[PDB]
């Protein structure tokens, strides 16, 4: 029991670090767009790319806000796009956009809250790593769901139990 | 404890294999945004400039890229191989690693296991590659990781299991 708890916690901490790395490499990727296309086109390319990531339904799901907290990308909550998210709350009462901004102002960090995986779905616990990308002038958040981390680690868990 | 640690390590490596497949998919999706609008030479130069930056990060993954025929397009560890056929390239442990990339890609994606330095002139160490043929770019793209790095990333988990004993 104690072993499984510390294992699960360690797997979550590892994923936190993975998200900071993935955010860095995603930034470096979209910088190609910004170097070579006009600003409006580069942003469109970034958000089309992030849609494709989310549509993959894999390790991470992106959320993007501007430095003032205007939501730029969030397919779970499409009606929020283009509006201030400063007063947006998750169902567990977290001002998730404020969290993104607070983490970014510190040079990167984490926000913890519940949200569905898709619009209208069951809410579940997740976390976001957010960072301010100087080139795009976007606060980019890579996010993962604890259910998915557990799924990915299920074979490890079953081996330890065996 | 020993059997525990063994099955744990093996499981962590298997997890990383899956991670590499996913990261390759999202990297392909990223580069496609400009393959769709620029000429091949320009788009390829951009993709490989990006991949240089990934490798320079010295983090989870390092890229290697070859063409469908095994010409090496990108490998900062082995810069003299770039622009040459890699079909007879052998790792220090005797693996035809480019042949491995291509055989894995022919199957729809897969793995190649070999020893290689982390940088040009470094000590060789054990690694693996996930490779996949990206039809849009017409490149065989390999995301790679070193076992030493996986172990480093998992050290706090290992120490926690050890403390519980």
Residue B144 maps to which CATH number? 3.30.450.20
Resolution (A): 1.4
Nearest to B29 among A18, A32, A49 (CB): A49
Total domain count for chain B?
A: 1
Rounded to whole angstroms, how far apart are CA atoms A58 and B22?
7
Rounded to whole angstroms, how far apart are CA atoms A51 and A45?
10
The residue written with tokens 């070579």 in the block is A36
The residue written with tokens 């050890």 in the block is B162
Q: Which of B119, B107, B121 is nearest to B146 (CA)?
A: B119
Helices (H) and strands (E) in chain B, counts: 5, 5
Rounded to whole angstroms, how far apart are CA atoms A123 and A117?
7
Residue A71 and residue A80 in contact, taking contact as beta carbons nearer than 8 Å: yes
Rounded to whole angstroms, how far apart are CA atoms B157 and B35?
41
Q: Residue B63: how many CB atoms within 10 A of its CB?
A: 23
β-strand partners of B131: B110, B142
Residue of A nearest to B164 (CA): A3
Nearest to B34 among A17, A33, A155 (CB): A33
Q: Which of A6, A12, A7 is nearest to A157 (CA)?
A: A7
On whether any CB of chain B is under 8 Å from the CB of A84, the answer is no
Residue B114 and residue B91 in contact, taking contact as beta carbons nearer than 8 Å: yes
User: Which structural domain, as residue segments, surrounds residue B97?
Assistant: 1-165
Half-sphere exposure of B17 (CA within 13 A, CB side): 12
Length of chain B counted residue by residue: 165
Burial B64-101 (b: 16+ CB within 10 A, else e): bbbbeebbbbbbebbeebbeeebeebebeeebbbbbbb
Helices (H) and strands (E) in chain A, counts: 5, 5
Residue B81 and residue B75 in contact, taking contact as beta carbons nearer than 8 Å: yes
Helical ranges in chain A per DSSP H: 2-36, 39-56, 96-105, 146-152, 154-161
């Amino acid at each position: 029991a104690q072993l499984m708890e510390h294992l699960e916690t360690g797997q979550y901490k590892k994923r936190e670090k993975t998200l900071a790395y993935m955010t860095k490499i995603l930034e470096q990727g979209i910088h190609e767009y910004y170097k070579s296309f006009d600003n409006d086109t580069a942003r469109k390319m970034a958000l089309d790319y992030f849609k494709r990531i989310n549509d993959d339904k894999g390790m991470i799901y992106m959320v993007v806000v501007d430095k003032n907290g205007v939501v730029l990308f969030d397919p779970v909550n499409p009606k929020t796009v283009g509006q201030s998210g400063l007063d947006a709350q998750s169902v567990d009462g977290v001002y998730y956009v404020r969290g993104y901004l607070e983490a970014a102002k510190k040079g990167g960090g984490y926000t913890y809250y519940k949200m569905p995986k898709y619009d209208g779905g069951v809410p579940e616990k997740k976390f976001a790593y957010s960072h301010y990308d100087e080139v795009s002038q976007m606060v980019i958040a890579a996010t993962s769901y604890y259910t998915d981390i557990n799924t990915e680690n299920k074979a490890i868990k079953e081996g330890v139990n065996k």
